């Protein structure tokens, strides 16, 4: 994490940097980036995975410098946040396929991590706002993580008593929760999901792709209390071990956020 | 409609058929091979269309300029633990795949829709809305297979499609994808807009003061570790901005 | 000579166009007869009811001209269109027919080899001919490439048809012409292959401008619009193996204006 | 040549037309647009293609309305393709699965076409400029083919040596020949490679579409000698014989070329 | 350096870059050596002929000060870029080498994972380490993130490298830093998967702007400026079961002009 003073005075312009780590489980001391293997055909009635198999949002509060000497002052200043460059780092490492994968077949070189997949990013001036949904409700979550309470079969589908704020790193588990279209006023959000045994996991690098933050006023995210918050989760795939045993993969996302400053009301 | 802000918000659930108390969002196990002579499909196997009529406030009428939409829990087919089918030996579970489809509209009248069938000799089972009289011709086109979308979890997803010849109040967007290796790919994003104003600048109208919504978000199967498959879908979001005009 | 537009002066047309796979029988209205596999080219003879064909429709327009020996006349000009495939969510039935994707699951999908085209023009549409094998005997009531050679399997521009019978010119035999249809609009999208899936989009809000770049629609000769289709939208296959094409009908909603030309 | 401006007026617009047959191979009198039976599994060191198994690249040569060369004329003007419609003809004859192609399992339809695609045109006011790439330099290539001369270990990478003028119908192997980036100065080209065994065919056909040939300043390709060069690759993908045999399918493409006087100094 | 106006009064510059995949034997340039596979995370040690690396060229320039004590000098500057995978249809070759599809039938396209990559800028290509397992022993001539530990198969900021040396950064080891090159524009897609078909185009008609937010392009501060690339196209099947890379070169034309900046 840098914080950088690009351009300083009434234009001034900060540029916030950092890499974000991924939470997929980390099972064991050399195992950082992957999953617990994935266990299978558990009964509904019967389903408690463990800890270290469930991959988790990844989240982040960056302090700011505060702005406002006197706190009495009819307007105050505030960090608004305008443009975002991001991108998912070390995309090649998968291109090792000889250690760990299953054959392909015979001779053959290792599997590809491939498979299910979901790619999604944050930014905003308040924590991300989250909707819980369950694929079944019956679920018993592990200690450690945070998941939807007194579910019902509801949870399924809609249930809005299931209503959190992505507040803990590594502890709200991806196949939970979703970001909230129904809050959200203070934050951007951009997710892609992709499911399925076989999808090949596409994935784009460039310094040169901005995304602008700025809603349909011209007003981008504002950061309450000095704090900005950047969000992820980046599930590449599944890796195939050679017993047959899939693990989880994900990989760290970088972050160049752009902040000015915005004059608005004392409250 | 002479000269010209509120917003109104939704989630409204899938109806899958949903075959008991805890399997909310699924429908009944699929059943296959049946000839086209003897085809009795049982009502919890059959998703319908969902809908709801959204109350307004009461010369001047509401128009729907924009809407924001989202198919709500993508994430949760990324339980691949409870139930699913393994991959292969000592594998992770099956993922959900295979045909889908993601539809919804928005509207001043209910959704107009036309009736086409697989198999026109398709016995369809009591609580559903189905195409009356049908013949061979309402596999193809068979414009007696009129209905508005009047009733939520009735009318089945397989029986019904948006009249492209009516609507003139409505605008409706869906997408099919079949096949039975169909991976689903869903997006998320607050920064996404739907206009709905026609080439004339013109909204969905609501006379009697009533918003219509609807939708169909089939996201595929899943597969139980016994083989059987049971559609799954998911809840929709609905954000509508509207503003008073003139008639 | 086209000179200005007129402006009682618009008018709307609509048609739903039923699919034309080869009926088989009177209950599978909208699929071929199944599909045979393995003919020698030499003795490839395909029945009729196993052929999926063009469909087409003629609409006559308002008579505009008292008399046709005028020095100037007024002439329909189509200006967009809507179109959209009908009935696409009918292959969310998995109960009926097909073969179960394996033991206790549901049926298979359609899927495979698909085409998808439209037209809209003031003639008939016109086609070439080009043929997988120009061996080939096909069966009496269709309309194919007249004394093919091996040359027809590439480019024989010999093989030239207007789209002028509904339920003839067998898709297989036959594409658009891009050397002619000066006077008619068309678009389509061929993908194949064994396990290709269904993509269909429909929606309400999208149009098809017809205007050239003169800013001059297809114009209706003879007070006739002319509509052409073919949705062939994969194989449906049978618990036994065997394989149907099926097919669905497209909507057309057209827009027309009056515009004057020089005769 | 320098470039000044459009000229317009009487006769200064023209449009020219082609449809330019595919060269797949043609290993007999009847199966025309294919290639011979593909083999397989031969060890680098003894890689012998048969002619016939070979798809080569198309080309032409349009004349155009005679412009006067003479540099010191009072009315110099060149040619100036300004827009093409192209698109591959017969797309639908895959629809054709009676005839030949292995069943998809028993009782089922014959199996469509699919597989490795390349989808290729040009347009030019000169022959289309080629760079040679070899997947083997050991191939033997057979006679009545032109192949990269005297390769190397380089030549499955680059070997400048390898430029070649798309000359000659029917003769230089898509295999071994790409359009060279680095020349094609008077020429637009256009190619798209899709490898594998079982991609689907994906092919649009309308008379609605136009591709431009104008550059960044406003010029298209400029006619030499008053010749429009059209060139061509369309390999659809394999067919798959009831033996198991596959064999290249080719289909012709439709050029429909719009052209301007161009004033030159 | 202070970026003032561009010099008006422009020139062109190209480059064929061959790939790096590892190259076997003296008949296999362009392929890597077979791949092991299963090889347990703890005793993972490939060969170097089995690992494409990244592959980058500097393209020198002259010096535009007459005057070195100017108050304003001159740089080249970067503006545009046209590029292309050189020799795509080579993969249509379905005879020589690869297994057949069935019985009878051609031989295997190749196809799989592939990563599409380059970049021009006017300083070498900075990058970051992410590895697949932190455990694994690279070979001699490679050169690979030091000391690493778990950490390292997420993000350790320590793994920073410059693209310095032509076949030794292997491209499984290292990505462009989106942190860093602030005077490089780079671009890559990674696909991964078995069957994943190759998808290329080439076309004379495209160019990549690369300029900034500000119209600034790389500036050739040291007169020199930098390629870079990596174009692993996929896996080839051997008859016998065993898989190679295939890479392929890159084409680069870039467009250059004169950019004033203020002396230091
Ligand atoms: C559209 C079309 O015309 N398809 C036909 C193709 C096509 O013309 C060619 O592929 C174009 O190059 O030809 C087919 O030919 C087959 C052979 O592949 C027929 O000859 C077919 O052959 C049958 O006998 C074959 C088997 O015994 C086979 C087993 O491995 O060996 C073949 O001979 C080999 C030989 O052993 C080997 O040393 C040599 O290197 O290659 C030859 C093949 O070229 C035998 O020919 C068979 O398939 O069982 C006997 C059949 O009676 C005969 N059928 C016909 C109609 O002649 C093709 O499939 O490629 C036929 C296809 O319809
Ligand atoms: C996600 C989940 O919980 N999946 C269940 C799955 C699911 O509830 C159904 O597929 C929804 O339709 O059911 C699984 O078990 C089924 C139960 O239906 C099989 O055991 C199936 O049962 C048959 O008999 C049932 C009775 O068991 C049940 O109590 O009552 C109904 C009538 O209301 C039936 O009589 C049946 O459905 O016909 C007998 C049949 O042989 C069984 N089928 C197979 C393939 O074994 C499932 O589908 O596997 C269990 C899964 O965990
Ligand atoms: C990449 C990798 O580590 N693959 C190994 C996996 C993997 O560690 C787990 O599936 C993660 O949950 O484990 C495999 O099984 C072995 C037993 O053969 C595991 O118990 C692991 O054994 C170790 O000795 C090892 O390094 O392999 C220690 C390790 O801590 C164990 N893993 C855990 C989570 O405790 C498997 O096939 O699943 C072996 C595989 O190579
Ligand atoms: C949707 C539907 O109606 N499917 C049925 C099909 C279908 O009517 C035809 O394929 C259309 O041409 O017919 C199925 O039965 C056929 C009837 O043709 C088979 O029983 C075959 O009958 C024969 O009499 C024949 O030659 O047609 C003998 C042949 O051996 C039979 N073929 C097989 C593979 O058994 C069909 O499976 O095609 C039944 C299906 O429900
Ligand atoms: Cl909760
Ligand atoms: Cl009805
Ligand atoms: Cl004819
Ligand atoms: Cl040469
Ligand atoms: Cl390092």
Known sequence: ?????????????????????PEMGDPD??????????????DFSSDSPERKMLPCYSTARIPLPNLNEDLTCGNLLMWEAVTVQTEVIGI??????????????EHG?????????????????????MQGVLMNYRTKYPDGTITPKNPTAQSQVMNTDHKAYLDKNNAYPVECWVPDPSR???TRYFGT??????????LHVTNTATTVLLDEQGVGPLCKADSLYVSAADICGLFTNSSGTQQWRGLA?????????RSVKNP
């Open 92 to 105: 090649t490492s998968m291109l090792n396929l000889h250690a760990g994968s299953q054959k392909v077949h």
């Open 1 to 21: 994490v840098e914080v950088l003073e690009v351009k300083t005075g009434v234009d001034a312009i900060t540029e916030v940097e950092c890499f974000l780590n």
């Open 29 to 42: 001391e050399n195992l950082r980036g992957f999953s617990l293997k994935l266990s299978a055909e558990n």
């Open 184 to 186: 959200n006023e203070n």
């Open 193 to 202: 999901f992709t499911g399925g045994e076989n999808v090949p996991p596409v």
């Open 253 to 261: 996302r970088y972050f160049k956020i752009r902040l000015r400053k």
């Open 109 to 129: 070189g290792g599997k590809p991590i491939q498979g299910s997949n979901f790619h999604f990013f944050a930014v905003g001036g308040d924590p991300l706002e």
